[PDB]
Structure formats: C-alpha cells, structure tokens
Amino acid sequence: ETFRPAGGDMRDNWRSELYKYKVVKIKPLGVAPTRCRRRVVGRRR
Amino acid sequence: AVGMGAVLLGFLGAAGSTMGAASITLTVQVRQLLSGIVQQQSNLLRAPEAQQHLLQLTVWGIKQLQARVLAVERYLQDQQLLGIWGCSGRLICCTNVPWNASWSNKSYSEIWDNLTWVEWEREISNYTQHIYNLLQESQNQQEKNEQDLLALDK
Amino acid sequence: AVGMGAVLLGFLGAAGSTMGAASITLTVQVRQLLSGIVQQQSNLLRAPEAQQHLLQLTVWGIKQLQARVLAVERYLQDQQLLGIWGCSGRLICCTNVPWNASWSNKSYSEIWDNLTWVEWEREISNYTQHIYNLLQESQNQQEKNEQDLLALDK
Amino acid sequence: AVGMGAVLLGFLGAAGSTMGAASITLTVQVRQLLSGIVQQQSNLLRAPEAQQHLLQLTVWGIKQLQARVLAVERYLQDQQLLGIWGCSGRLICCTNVPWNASWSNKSYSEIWDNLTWVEWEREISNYTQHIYNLLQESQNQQEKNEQDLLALDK
C-alpha cells in the first residue's frame, strides 16, 4: 500500500494536540445507605 | 493517606479510593464547584475590572461570561436541592428516608470499604432521581407535620 | 387532597387552597424559583454547550441570559433575607418577633383554615416591609447579645 | 449608639467603632453585598423588564450585567467558604480551631474594646489565608470523624 499527504480539514491539526484531553462535569451530590436516621435519633443517643 | 493540607489541594483525589475514604475530601470538591481547582504556590490578584476595552463582546469575552454564569447556575441547583431535602449547609446529611434493597443490598463495608463513589453511583444510576423525589417528598411530609403541630399548639 | 408524588408536580397547586394546606407544597414552589416548572413524563438532557455559533448575541440569546441571571438574582435576595432573619435553610422558621394585632387580629383557624396565602398577603400588604425590618432588627439584637455573652465568657 | 431602625440604614456605620460594637451591624453589611446600600425615604419598583430596545449591548448595558454578575459571583464565594467551614447561615460561627498567639496575643478587651475590624484585619493580614486553610482542614477532620462513627454504628 502507498500513502500520500492530506491537509483538507484543520480539525486534524486540533485532534493532533488535544488527543490526551477530555472534559468532564463534576457531580457533587451523592446518596448512600447509612444507619443514621433524622429527627431525634442517630441510632440510640 | 496524605496530610490535612494536601487534602485541600487534592481535587478528585479520592476518585479511585474507597467511598469511606472520600469523606475527608468533601470540602475540596465543593470549593471547586465555583472557584475551579485550587492554586497553591501562586495566588495572584483576582479582583474585578480587567476589561479595559470593547473586549467583553468578543469570542473569549462571551465564552467567559457563559462559563462564569453556568458555574453558579449549576451550584445553586445542587444547593436548592439539598435545601428542599432539609440538608442545607450539610456535607453529610441524614434523612428520614429508609434505604431500599432494590436500590442496593450491599452492607456498609460492601459499599464503603469496597466501592468508589462513581462506581457506586453507577449502580444506583437507575434509582437516583426516584430517591431524589422521596427525599423531597419526605421533607414535605415533615413540613406538613409541623403545621399540624402548630394547629394543636393553640 | 393528592399524593406525595403529585405534590411535587403541582406548582402553585394550593393557590386557592387554605393556608394550612399549602405547607405540604412549600418545596415545590421553591424548586421553581430556579428551575421553573417541573417536568415529569419527559426529562431531556439539560447539560451545557448548546451554542455552536455567534447566536449568543442575538435577540433570544441575550433574552435567555437576562432571564437566566434574573432568576438567580432574585433567588439570592430571598435567601439573603431569610439569612439575616436567622432562617437560613428553613422552609418554616420561627422568630423572636411577636405578632401585632394591628397587622392582623385573626385567630389561627381564622387564617390557616380560612384564608389563601395571596388573600392573606394582601391583608398584610401594608405592614409587610416593616415586619421585614423587625425580623432583621431582631436578628441583630440577637447577634449583639452573643457578643455580650462572649465578653462575660472570659 | 443609635436605634434598631437606624442600625439597618447605617452601612459601614461601625467602621471606626470598636470591634465589639460592630456586631449589631452584621446583617446590614451582609444585605449590601447583593442589593447595595439600603434606601429609606424612597422605595421604587425594582421589577424586571426595563430594556425595551437593543440597549443591552451598549456601554452601560454590558457594564451593568458585569456588575450584576460579579456581585453574586463574589457573594457565593463568601458563602461557599462559610459552608466548608461548617458555618452556613451563621453571622457569628464558633469553630474547633484554637487561636494562635503568633496570629495575635491580645486579650478579649485588647481586641474587642480597642480595635476596629479593618484595624485588626490588618494585624491578622498575614496569617489569614492560613487560618482559612485550618478552618477548612478542621471541617474535613470532622466529616472524617462522622464516617468513622457511621462505621462502628453498625
């Protein structure tokens, strides 16, 4: 097989540098089971 | 396990760590929600008035404003939520809502000593908003009970 | 009277209902202040980055930003107020301020079992900001008393 | 020493006054952070929709938006901070962090009956952010201890 140079889409120039990056959104709220109730109790106290 | 001063610098530092260990780092994740990642060795002057021309309408100008407002837009949602769950100003808030095995039937240690939060949140991925709805439904059934109490209370 | 899950959906649903009945629906009014009216059957992806062109400076672009910021602008005022009354994170907050017959001389049931909130707020329309001023004046006379206490307390 | 109703109007009114006397005026400084200085004799209609043309992109139009957003931008930072110190909704909040003579070795009265806040904040100018870091490090060591407690608690 033979290869030739291409330069049509500038996005490849940008992909060439950005490949090692990705952006995420942080999700600070979290919910989980626990032996802690509300009002007048946190398991006998 | 690192020091109290490093904990402050380690945003998402207990990401691959076990859920129980992540609790020392709750504040540091919270602070990022508005101010981004913390800066140590250098702390420049972040005051107002740095736009001295018509640069507020440019590409970056608009982009920055969008990023600035979105950042608080989102922060409030998380707060307002905690608020109508009755967990305002709490990084760890106990509720009245009992846990459901259908949501998950893991013991304490099966979770807290075995799972990472993102790992666990992926397990609870399905049942989350429904819980969010119970959390809020609880809060109301509380507020109802208070007015109930104010009626008998002369 | 409807269910706990419907209460969540019923924004302004106790508007014509009696004041005592409105308390189960406090959270649902609060949530609207930032997110607007809740959506049930459909819950699309509300994430960032939907402006892919120079559309942020158009009619709707500007309008949306104005509506977005105004929404939080107002939310904070309501919070900051509750805050300087010492009622932060409370949907029902007791105060130190005694009620005044001049404001209204209706019994509990004459209000809570007989009036709607907008109906009542129209009666208290005149004396409201003055109360808002007492609420705040109380909070200060509290903070004063604390510093007083910190002085005697060695 | 003035009245409770004047205290409300006197923004930065205990600026040259002694630190102990400034506590009655905490709320009035707080309210300014979002709404600016309070208005008494006149209270006009501050509702939305006053931009009836393409005036939102002009000099003042942009300037106002910048000032509006910056105002809340900053307010939240102060709140979020108090929050991760565990002092949410408190105008005076006690902590677990012990005072350090190196920071200052003045007695109560040597401070509260002798200094103005800006005067004192200038003395503590150096050691402030480090304290801000301890305040936050404390809060974490608290949250850690809670999860600790949730483990033994079955």
Ligand SMILES: *[C@@H]1O[C@H](CO)[C@@H](O[C@@H]2O[C@H](CO)[C@@H](O)[C@H](O)[C@H]2NC(C)=O)[C@H](O)[C@H]1NC(C)=O
């Ligand atoms: C745990 O959650 C599940 C689903 O959320 C509940 O199971 C059923 O949920 C449907 C509504 O989606 C109800 O119509 C059924 O009555 C529920 N089943 C039962 C047996 O009640 C389940 O109820 C929850 N666990 C508990 C203890 O309520």
Ligand SMILES: *[C@@H]1O[C@H](CO)[C@@H](O[C@@H]2O[C@H](CO)[C@@H](O)[C@H](O)[C@H]2NC(C)=O)[C@H](O)[C@H]1NC(C)=O
């Ligand atoms: C959450 O629920 C979804 C379904 O709504 C699960 O995704 C797949 O759902 C189909 C249809 O019910 C099942 O046949 C597949 O087995 C599910 N995928 C897998 C990998 O089991 C999804 O798995 C659920 N999340 C978790 C963590 O179980």
Ligand SMILES: *[C@@H]1O[C@H](CO)[C@@H](O[C@@H]2O[C@H](CO)[C@@H](O)[C@H](O)[C@H]2NC(C)=O)[C@H](O)[C@H]1NC(C)=O
């Ligand atoms: C109830 O409110 C009214 C008006 O807010 C108070 O009536 C008078 O208010 C003026 C100031 O606007 C004072 O100068 C008078 O001294 C008030 N009258 C009396 C008899 O004190 C009224 O005081 C309030 N009720 C109570 C119990 O303080």
Ligand SMILES: *[C@@H]1O[C@H](CO)[C@@H](O[C@@H]2O[C@H](CO)[C@@H](O)[C@H](O)[C@H]2NC(C)=O)[C@H](O)[C@H]1NC(C)=O
């Ligand atoms: C609130 O106070 C205003 C007055 O500031 C009341 O409006 C009218 O005021 C004039 C002048 O004092 C009176 O002669 C009228 O009788 C008032 N209107 C009515 C319908 O009584 C207004 O009524 C007051 N609000 C309430 C709920 O009484």
Ligand SMILES: *[C@@H]1O[C@H](CO)[C@@H](O[C@@H]2O[C@H](CO)[C@@H](O)[C@H](O)[C@H]2NC(C)=O)[C@H](O)[C@H]1NC(C)=O
């Ligand atoms: C009061 O603060 C000072 C400085 O913040 C502490 O003094 C030294 O701080 C350095 C770090 O900057 C430590 O390496 C030293 O160990 C500290 N000295 C001592 C004697 O501990 C000082 O520790 C603080 N006071 C107390 C009681 O901890």
Ligand SMILES: *[C@@H]1O[C@H](CO)[C@@H](O[C@@H]2O[C@H](CO)[C@@H](O)[C@H](O)[C@H]2NC(C)=O)[C@H](O)[C@H]1NC(C)=O
């Ligand atoms: C806060 O610390 C700075 C130093 O970081 C003080 O400013 C001067 O620092 C130099 C170098 O250490 C000293 O030689 C000077 O004596 C300091 N100035 C003065 C007026 O003493 C600064 O003074 C400190 N703040 C306070 C309130 O003491």
